[PDB]
Design an enzyme around this catalytic site. Structure first.
Site, PDB file in Angstrom:
ATOM      1  N   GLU A 123       0.806  -1.212   0.000  1.00 60.14           N
ATOM      2  CA  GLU A 123       0.000   0.000   0.000  1.00 60.14           C
ATOM      3  C   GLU A 123       0.842   1.266   0.000  1.00 60.14           C
ATOM      4  O   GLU A 123       0.283   2.364  -0.078  1.00 60.14           O
ATOM      5  CB  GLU A 123      -0.945   0.015   1.209  1.00 60.14           C
ATOM      6  CG  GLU A 123      -2.090  -0.996   1.155  1.00 60.14           C
ATOM      7  CD  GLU A 123      -3.392  -0.410   0.610  1.00 60.14           C
ATOM      8  OE1 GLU A 123      -3.684   0.774   0.892  1.00 60.14           O
ATOM      9  OE2 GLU A 123      -4.127  -1.139  -0.094  1.00 60.14           O
TER      10      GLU A 123
ATOM     11  N   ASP B 165      -5.598  10.352  -1.652  1.00 59.32           N
ATOM     12  CA  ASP B 165      -5.743   8.930  -1.925  1.00 59.32           C
ATOM     13  C   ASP B 165      -5.978   8.689  -3.415  1.00 59.32           C
ATOM     14  O   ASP B 165      -6.029   9.618  -4.229  1.00 59.32           O
ATOM     15  CB  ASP B 165      -6.885   8.346  -1.092  1.00 59.32           C
TER      16      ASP B 165
END
Ligand SMILES: CC(C)(c1ccc(O)cc1)c1ccc(OCc2cccc(COc3ccc(C(=N)N)cc3)c2)cc1
Length: 439
Positions: free
Chosen positions: A213, A222
């Site tokens: 991630e 994001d």
């Protein structure tokens, strides 16, 4: 056998003098004379090893009473010695509750501890424990008085007006002395060992997720254009930076101004798996399979859930149950045809590899090994030596009150059996200095 129980109780009380007096007198010494900043962990030890010292100061009296044949110190003597003894049990066990109740807050959320574990808010608790310990031993000075038995022998023990009076107080010093703490220190200290199973042993789950991630230590946007920091920790469903930045500072407790440490990124990540594992265990579909998966293959369920959310990973039922049935090769090859495998294949070719191999081989080699256990591993033995010494005594208190409502000569063993259990417990005051000298 009339002579050997007094023989056994007079050595233990004397070995506790030869071991507990010097050790505690030294342990209490260093923490006062040779320290400037007395740590909170140096105050628990202090008062706990300070109280344990007072109990042993009464030992020369019971030994004398054990051999002379009669009490020799008047009403004050036997009204006091039991009160001093009764207050250390209460003070000692509450400190052990607090110490154990705390190492569960250092793993539940380590950012609140810095804002809650203050020496000023620890000292101002000890008084509470002491004050709330000085009160809970008060019945012992109302119910223990000397009674003249023979012209040349006056004995001392509890004079309970009725047996109902004796019953409840014998039960009352069991729940409160031991059972309430033993239940508390079992909830907190087993919540932890049940918390780490999700978090995985060592830091192994973290570095795995870092590769995947991405590890960033500053606020960014994001994939869907939203504020996150660290390994995907969503700060807020909001547009404003100062709102997003301030939102972070609340969960860290310090003025970051937009930056967190490698540690702060990791602890914060644990809250992202701690709360992502309850969603799994509270999910209809992926709870059963997860329970079957070993510690290695579990983190990848935690990985996919991190990737697509439980509602999304719950879709691969046929690839879900194949794991539950411990057939990996038919789940490794079955997951190969998913869009998930197509849209992101660098992270899918290794997550799937951790399933069929059940090892961290695909991720790294030798950079994950840590000793996650802290100095609380020492804090978890001084409670067991305590519990192993105080359970014999309390079961009798628990069995006398229970068996004083129905039914002498059969129960004439209890006081003979309580004598050793009561005298065995005189070693718990002398168990910390050896555990500190265990190194
Ligand atoms: C064994 C003896 C001498 C006796 C006497 C006549 C006889 O025929 C046979 C035996 C006796 C008499 C009375 C007595 O009552 C006091 C008592 C009873 C249990 C327990 C404690 C406190 O222990 C503690 C408290 C706190 C700590 C601590 N870690 N801070 C450690 C130990 C006090 C105890 C023993």
């Amino acid at each position: 056998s009339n002579t050997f129980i007094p023989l056994l109780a007079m050595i233990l009380l004397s070995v506790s003098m030869v071991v507990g007096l010097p050790g505690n007198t030294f342990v209490v010494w260093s923490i006062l004379k040779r320290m400037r900043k007395r740590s909170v962990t140096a105050l628990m030890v202090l008062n706990l090893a300070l109280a344990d010292l007072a109990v042993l100061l009464t030992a020369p009296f019971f030994l004398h009473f054990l051999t002379w044949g009669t009490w020799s110190f008047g009403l004050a003597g036997c009204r006091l010695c039991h009160y001093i003894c009764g207050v250390s049990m209460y003070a000692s066990v509450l400190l052990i509750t607090a110490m154990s109740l705390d190492r569960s807050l250092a793993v539940a959320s380590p950012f609140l501890s810095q804002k809650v574990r203050t020496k000023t808010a620890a000292r101002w608790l000890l008084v509470g424990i002491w004050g709330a310990s000085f009160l809970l031993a008060t019945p012992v000075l109302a119910f223990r008085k000397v009674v003249k038995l023979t012209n040349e022998t006056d004995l001392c023990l509890a004079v309970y007006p009725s047996d109902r009076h004796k019953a409840f107080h014998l039960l009352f010093e069991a729940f409160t002395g031991f059972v309430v703490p033993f239940l508390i220190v079992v909830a907190s200290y087993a919540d932890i060992s049940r918390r780490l199973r999700a978090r995985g042993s060592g830091s192994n789950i973290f570095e795995m997720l870092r590769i995947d991630e991405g590890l960033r230590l500053k606020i960014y946007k994001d994939t869907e254009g939203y504020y996150t920091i660290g390994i995907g920790h969503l700060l807020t469903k909001s547009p404003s930076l100062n709102a997003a930045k301030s939102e972070l500072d609340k969960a860290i407790g310090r003025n970051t101004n937009g930056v967190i440490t490698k540690d702060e990124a990791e602890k914060l990540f644990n809250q992202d798996v701690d709360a992502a594992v309850r969603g799994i265990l509270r999910n209809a579909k992926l709870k059963p399979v997860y329970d079957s998966l070993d510690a290695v293959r579990r983190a990848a369920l935690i990985n996919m859930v991190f990737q697509m959310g439980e509602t999304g990973v719950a879709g691969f039922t046929n690839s879900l149950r194949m794991l539950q049935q411990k057939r990996w090769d038919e789940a490794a090859v079955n997951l190969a045809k998913s869009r998930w495998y197509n849209q992101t294949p660098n992270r899918a070719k290794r997550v799937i590899t951790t399933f069929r191999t059940g090892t961290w081989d695909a991720y790294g080699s030798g950079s994950r090994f840590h000793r996650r256990r802290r100095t609380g591993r020492l804090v978890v033995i001084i409670i067991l030596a305590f519990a192993a010494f105080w359970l014999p005594y309390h079961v009798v208190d628990l069995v006398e009150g229970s068996r004083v409502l129905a039914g002498d000569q059969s129960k004439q063993q209890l006081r003979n059996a309580r004598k050793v259990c009561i005298a065995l417990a005189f070693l718990s005051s002398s168990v910390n200095p050896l555990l500190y000298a265990c190194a």
